Design an enzyme around this catalytic site. Sequence first.
Site, PDB file in Angstrom:
ATOM      1  N   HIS A  29     -35.118 163.326 -11.261  1.00 21.24           N
ATOM      2  CA  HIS A  29     -36.578 163.471 -10.991  1.00 21.24           C
ATOM      3  C   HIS A  29     -37.245 164.595 -11.792  1.00 21.24           C
ATOM      4  O   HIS A  29     -38.496 164.656 -11.755  1.00 21.24           O
ATOM      5  CB  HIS A  29     -36.852 163.571  -9.482  1.00 21.24           C
ATOM      6  CG  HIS A  29     -36.652 164.896  -8.833  1.00 21.24           C
ATOM      7  ND1 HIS A  29     -35.523 165.174  -8.087  1.00 21.24           N
ATOM      8  CD2 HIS A  29     -37.412 166.017  -8.830  1.00 21.24           C
ATOM      9  CE1 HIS A  29     -35.622 166.420  -7.638  1.00 21.24           C
ATOM     10  NE2 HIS A  29     -36.767 166.972  -8.090  1.00 21.24           N
ATOM     11  N   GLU A  53     -29.916 160.214  -8.554  1.00 22.40           N
ATOM     12  CA  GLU A  53     -30.462 161.549  -8.892  1.00 22.40           C
ATOM     13  C   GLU A  53     -29.616 162.302  -9.944  1.00 22.40           C
ATOM     14  O   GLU A  53     -30.025 163.463 -10.241  1.00 22.40           O
ATOM     15  CB  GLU A  53     -30.700 162.380  -7.618  1.00 22.40           C
ATOM     16  CG  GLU A  53     -32.047 162.036  -6.940  1.00 22.40           C
ATOM     17  CD  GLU A  53     -33.224 162.819  -7.554  1.00 22.40           C
ATOM     18  OE1 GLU A  53     -33.754 163.735  -6.866  1.00 22.40           O
ATOM     19  OE2 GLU A  53     -33.503 162.640  -8.776  1.00 22.40           O
ATOM     20  N   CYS A 138     -34.503 172.650  -8.975  1.00 26.22           N
ATOM     21  CA  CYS A 138     -33.775 171.368  -9.132  1.00 26.22           C
ATOM     22  C   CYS A 138     -33.173 171.252 -10.541  1.00 26.22           C
ATOM     23  O   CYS A 138     -33.843 171.654 -11.538  1.00 26.22           O
ATOM     24  CB  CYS A 138     -34.626 170.148  -8.770  1.00 26.22           C
ATOM     25  SG  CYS A 138     -34.961 170.016  -6.976  1.00 26.22           S
TER      26      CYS A 138
END
Lengths: 172, 172
Positions: A29, A53, A138
């Site tokens: 993402h 992911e 992230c």
Amino acid sequence: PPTLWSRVTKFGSGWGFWVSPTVFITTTHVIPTSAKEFFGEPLTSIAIHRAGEFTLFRFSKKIRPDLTGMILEEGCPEGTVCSVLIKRDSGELLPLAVRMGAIASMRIQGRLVHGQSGMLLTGANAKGMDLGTIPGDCGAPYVYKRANDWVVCGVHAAATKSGNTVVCAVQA
Amino acid sequence: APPTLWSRVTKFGSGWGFWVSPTVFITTTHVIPTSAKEFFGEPLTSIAIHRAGEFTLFRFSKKIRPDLTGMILEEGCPEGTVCSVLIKRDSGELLPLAVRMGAIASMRIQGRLVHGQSGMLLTGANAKGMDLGTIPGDCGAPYVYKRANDWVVCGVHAAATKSGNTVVCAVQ
Ligand SMILES: Nc1ccccc1OCc1ccccc1
């Protein structure tokens, strides 16, 4: 001799990690959706391997020739204590101990995320102190030491508001 | 950790020290050169030196760091407190290492008898080395924690075991 930290690189809306001179891993993402190149290489030159992911990039030339190749595995044994290697735009480096659990689909702030669960070992509430993850983190890698060998086993995908629970996305 | 805390962390002798106020500087006794007679361009005469084992406090007659506010220095912290050790590394990288503090302890480490507040690193499971743990050049780095709306300094880095998982804070 290059530290683990030199492999952590700002990328998209977060970070990624150089496994070798040609291999870069990140959280799916955080990757831009409008691009014609990454790290100066046209996208035609890049093999992109997406599994939920987890994303791996393999470049046709050596982007980080200063590095050796290190071991990449599909998660780690349940109960392994990993470090999440968090960089911040202040210049702070925040290695945080995480106890790894099962592979699962977990409800994290109202959304399903699939990967290896983990629990932060830095105590009650980080809030105030440099003890917990934030949204901009992230793509940070999960690593651990196994005899003389360093191992990378996935990338930071999600965390609860609470703070205790994280998800490490893993290679298929 | 806040910028004002990093501003106080000062390269000194073979390690570091920390400005508690404009007139008060704390360090680990072993990083001070044995021959030194001048500090921040002031002679010994103009300085009050208070030494307890591996804890040294310098009190200046003049304001050396008038940019700073005085903060709270305590004699260690409650067993169970999570502190940050404010370590500077090769290139403006800032490493606030998480540590869980325990009891006051007397230990033998390599060739030395060491006394202070023990703790265990919360950065990973096998912390030996520069990525996740301390190195000898880190001596004198401060141990800090947040209490309600205040930060506290409670000691300076004195030693780490051969494994690197245990550290010792020298205390006033
Ligand atoms: N392993 C384990 C087993 C049960 C409950 C916690 C656990 O984590 C151990 C641990 C390692 C490093 C830093 C802090 C803690």
